[PDB]
Design an enzyme around this catalytic site. Structure first.
Site, mmCIF file in Angstrom:
data_model
loop_
_atom_site.group_PDB
_atom_site.id
_atom_site.type_symbol
_atom_site.label_atom_id
_atom_site.label_comp_id
_atom_site.label_asym_id
_atom_site.label_seq_id
_atom_site.Cartn_x
_atom_site.Cartn_y
_atom_site.Cartn_z
ATOM 1 N N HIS A 20 -8.444 -7.209 10.500
ATOM 2 C CA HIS A 20 -8.548 -5.472 10.061
ATOM 3 C C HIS A 20 -8.502 -4.846 11.030
ATOM 4 O O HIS A 20 -10.227 -4.290 11.088
ATOM 5 C CB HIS A 20 -9.537 -5.434 9.134
ATOM 6 C CG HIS A 20 -8.744 -6.393 7.393
ATOM 7 N ND1 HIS A 20 -9.185 -7.334 7.499
ATOM 8 C CD2 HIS A 20 -8.342 -5.206 6.648
ATOM 9 C CE1 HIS A 20 -8.473 -7.598 6.153
ATOM 10 N NE2 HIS A 20 -8.147 -6.345 5.258
ATOM 11 N N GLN A 71 0.477 -18.556 -0.347
ATOM 12 C CA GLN A 71 1.847 -17.519 -0.091
ATOM 13 C C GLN A 71 3.237 -16.636 -1.608
ATOM 14 O O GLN A 71 3.017 -15.724 -1.942
ATOM 15 C CB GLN A 71 2.345 -16.954 1.039
ATOM 16 C CG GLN A 71 1.642 -16.836 2.694
ATOM 17 C CD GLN A 71 0.904 -15.326 2.058
ATOM 18 O OE1 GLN A 71 1.836 -14.952 2.488
ATOM 19 N NE2 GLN A 71 -0.533 -15.716 2.110
ATOM 20 N N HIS A 78 -9.306 4.059 6.527
ATOM 21 C CA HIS A 78 -9.010 3.589 5.585
ATOM 22 C C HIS A 78 -10.017 2.181 5.457
ATOM 23 O O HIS A 78 -10.577 1.023 4.355
ATOM 24 C CB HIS A 78 -7.944 3.005 4.423
ATOM 25 C CG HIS A 78 -7.201 2.085 5.055
ATOM 26 N ND1 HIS A 78 -6.089 1.942 6.235
ATOM 27 C CD2 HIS A 78 -7.160 0.717 4.771
ATOM 28 C CE1 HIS A 78 -5.655 1.318 6.593
ATOM 29 N NE2 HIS A 78 -6.108 -0.275 5.040
ATOM 30 N N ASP A 79 -9.925 1.097 6.863
ATOM 31 C CA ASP A 79 -10.733 -0.080 7.252
ATOM 32 C C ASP A 79 -11.871 0.181 7.779
ATOM 33 O O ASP A 79 -12.137 -0.725 8.281
ATOM 34 C CB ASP A 79 -9.977 -1.019 7.792
ATOM 35 C CG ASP A 79 -9.629 -1.306 6.278
ATOM 36 O OD1 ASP A 79 -9.881 -1.708 5.429
ATOM 37 O OD2 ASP A 79 -7.988 -2.051 6.552
ATOM 38 N N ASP A 107 -1.445 -0.675 1.855
ATOM 39 C CA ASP A 107 -2.461 -1.669 3.299
ATOM 40 C C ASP A 107 -1.635 -2.912 2.768
ATOM 41 O O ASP A 107 -2.091 -3.880 3.954
ATOM 42 C CB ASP A 107 -3.580 -1.904 1.900
ATOM 43 C CG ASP A 107 -4.470 -2.452 2.461
ATOM 44 O OD1 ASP A 107 -4.248 -2.351 3.857
ATOM 45 O OD2 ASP A 107 -6.111 -2.796 1.847
ATOM 46 N N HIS A 142 -3.747 -2.031 12.465
ATOM 47 C CA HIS A 142 -3.392 -2.182 11.101
ATOM 48 C C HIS A 142 -3.676 -1.097 10.859
ATOM 49 O O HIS A 142 -3.110 -0.251 9.860
ATOM 50 C CB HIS A 142 -4.817 -3.549 10.403
ATOM 51 C CG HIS A 142 -4.823 -3.002 8.749
ATOM 52 N ND1 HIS A 142 -3.619 -3.590 7.799
ATOM 53 C CD2 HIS A 142 -5.544 -3.007 7.454
ATOM 54 C CE1 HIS A 142 -3.700 -3.580 6.892
ATOM 55 N NE2 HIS A 142 -5.277 -3.094 6.376
HETATM 56 C C1 LIG Z 1 -5.188 -7.893 0.922
HETATM 57 N N1 LIG Z 1 -4.363 -8.640 1.786
HETATM 58 C C2 LIG Z 1 -3.368 -7.928 2.363
HETATM 59 C C3 LIG Z 1 -2.658 -10.216 2.798
HETATM 60 C C4 LIG Z 1 -1.911 -9.534 3.328
HETATM 61 C C5 LIG Z 1 -1.015 -11.170 2.973
HETATM 62 C C6 LIG Z 1 0.068 -11.002 3.960
HETATM 63 N N2 LIG Z 1 0.273 -10.743 5.674
HETATM 64 C C7 LIG Z 1 -0.449 -9.709 5.664
HETATM 65 C C8 LIG Z 1 -1.701 -9.304 5.039
HETATM 66 C C9 LIG Z 1 -3.858 -10.857 1.691
HETATM 67 C C10 LIG Z 1 -3.584 -11.694 1.328
HETATM 68 C C11 LIG Z 1 -3.575 -12.357 -0.021
HETATM 69 C C12 LIG Z 1 -3.181 -13.812 0.030
HETATM 70 C C13 LIG Z 1 -3.046 -14.323 0.937
HETATM 71 O O1 LIG Z 1 -3.883 -16.148 0.684
HETATM 72 C C14 LIG Z 1 -2.966 -16.894 -0.701
HETATM 73 C C15 LIG Z 1 -3.869 -18.184 -0.864
HETATM 74 C C16 LIG Z 1 -3.789 -17.666 -2.409
HETATM 75 C C17 LIG Z 1 -4.396 -20.124 -2.142
HETATM 76 C C18 LIG Z 1 -4.318 -20.853 -1.024
HETATM 77 C C19 LIG Z 1 -4.378 -22.473 -0.180
HETATM 78 C C20 LIG Z 1 -4.683 -22.738 1.031
HETATM 79 C C21 LIG Z 1 -3.569 -21.962 1.999
HETATM 80 C C22 LIG Z 1 -3.566 -20.724 2.009
HETATM 81 C C23 LIG Z 1 -3.864 -20.002 0.324
HETATM 82 N N3 LIG Z 1 -3.027 -18.917 0.296
HETATM 83 C C24 LIG Z 1 -3.171 -14.571 2.705
HETATM 84 C C25 LIG Z 1 -3.459 -12.857 2.372
HETATM 85 N N4 LIG Z 1 -3.995 -10.189 1.375
HETATM 86 MG MG LIG Z 2 -9.237 -2.874 3.864
HETATM 87 ZN ZN LIG Z 3 -6.475 -2.344 4.888
#
Ligand SMILES: Cn1cc(-c2ccncc2)c(-c2ccc(OCc3ccc4ccccc4n3)cc2)n1
Ligand SMILES: [Mg+2]
Ligand SMILES: [Zn+2]
Length: 305
Positions: free
Chosen positions: A63, A264, A101-102, A212, A67
């Site tokens: 962040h 993911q 925004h951040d 975002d 970004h």
């Molecule tokens: C607001 N925002 C941006 C992003 C993002 C995402 C990818 N690339 C850049 C930004 C995310 C985001 C959302 C979920 C996430 O992981 C979900 C998840 C759920 C259970 C799990 C259990 C074990 C390991 C891992 C696990 N990951 C990781 C990033 N939120």
């Molecule tokens: Mg934000």
């Molecule tokens: Zn952001």
């Protein structure tokens, strides 16, 4: 002045802004100039503003300043591919909103600030960080020589600040789910009305989410690498949760890192794919974002196989 490669490739939705931090301000000015005109802002005021914004981003893994400019770039690509849909004021406001925004992000979620009992959570009970980001935007605007909106009437000033406030608050992902649900219903029933300010606000909200999250709309090598930075923050937050004596959710728990591909997959299914699907329905020219997102989904599926 912008390199020829950047002049060409900046128009691609999947453009990456590169590792040269000193080039990002010029990249932003170029986007402002192209969307808003060279007479839109006084150049010196604009530059001063940009540098003070940069200064108030922190050196956190995700962040951060990179970004902010990346999110602004995605908004530029949306606006450029939807000529005539958004007003001059909306275009200036949204690009500025994306840049800001951040502001002053710490690398911790709203949930963490709440659990920590941080002073910001007492000040702003909901959308905590996002309310702060807007507060920081106004503070910067109020510095001597930083009012890039000084040429607007008082009324247009208030109007663009409200555009900015709504846009920044919309980047609270907690708000996305309800927003996208409403938009999808409006689309399906044929009731979406872009001339209706409340509907307009929702579309802009969805645009902000789409921008975002745009790291998931880059080409795989970029997306794959960016995932490192987001998890660096989440796992640090997970550590901090454990130090509060609270078991973090798996996403934030470094012990569960082997489950990243599955996590993911969940995120793309529940959030990213629906987001870009809904956006493309409303703004067909945004389709490359959805295509790139599906491609990355497939890559995660491949990792699992
Ligand atoms: C607001 N925002 C941006 C992003 C993002 C995402 C990818 N690339 C850049 C930004 C995310 C985001 C959302 C979920 C996430 O992981 C979900 C998840 C759920 C259970 C799990 C259990 C074990 C390991 C891992 C696990 N990951 C990781 C990033 N939120
Ligand atoms: Mg934000
Ligand atoms: Zn952001």
């Amino acid at each position: 002045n912008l390199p020829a490669r950047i002049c060409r490739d900046i128009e691609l939705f999947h453009f990456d802004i590169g590792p040269f931090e000193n080039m990002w301000p010029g990249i932003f000015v170029y986007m402002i100039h192209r969307s808003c005109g060279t007479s839109c802002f006084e150049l010196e005021k604009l530059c001063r503003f940009i540098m003070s914004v940069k200064k108030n981003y922190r050196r956190v893994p995700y962040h951060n300043w990179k970004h902010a400019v990346t999110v602004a770039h995605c908004m530029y690509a949306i606006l450029q591919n939807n000529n005539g849909l958004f007003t001059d004021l909306e275009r200036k406001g949204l690009l500025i909103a994306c840049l800001c925004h951040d502001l002053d992000h710490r690398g911790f979620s709203n949930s963490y600030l709440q659990k920590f009992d941080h002073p910001l959570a007492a000040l702003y009970s909901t959308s905590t960080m996002e309310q702060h980001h807007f507060s920081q935007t106004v503070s910067i605007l109020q510095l001597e020589g930083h009012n890039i909106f000084s040429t607007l009437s008082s009324s247009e000033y208030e109007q663009v600040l409200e555009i900015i406030r709504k846009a920044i608050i919309a980047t609270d992902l907690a708000l996305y789910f309800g927003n996208r649900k409403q938009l999808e219903e409006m689309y399906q029933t044929g009731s979406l009305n872009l001339h209706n300010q409340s509907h307009r606000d929702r579309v802009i909200g969805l645009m902000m989410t789409a921008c975002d999250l745009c790291s998931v709309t880059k080409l795989w090598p970029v997306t794959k690498l960016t995932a490192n930075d987001i998890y660096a923050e989440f796992w640090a937050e997970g550590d901090e949760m454990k130090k509060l004596g609270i078991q973090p959710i798996p996403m934030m728990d470094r012990d569960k890192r082997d489950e990243v591909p599955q996590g993911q997959l969940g995120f793309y299914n529940a959030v990213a794919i629906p987001c870009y699907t809904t956006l493309t329905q409303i703004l067909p020219p945004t389709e490359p974002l959805l295509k790139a997102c599906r491609d990355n989904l497939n890559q995660w599926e491949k990792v699992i196989r």
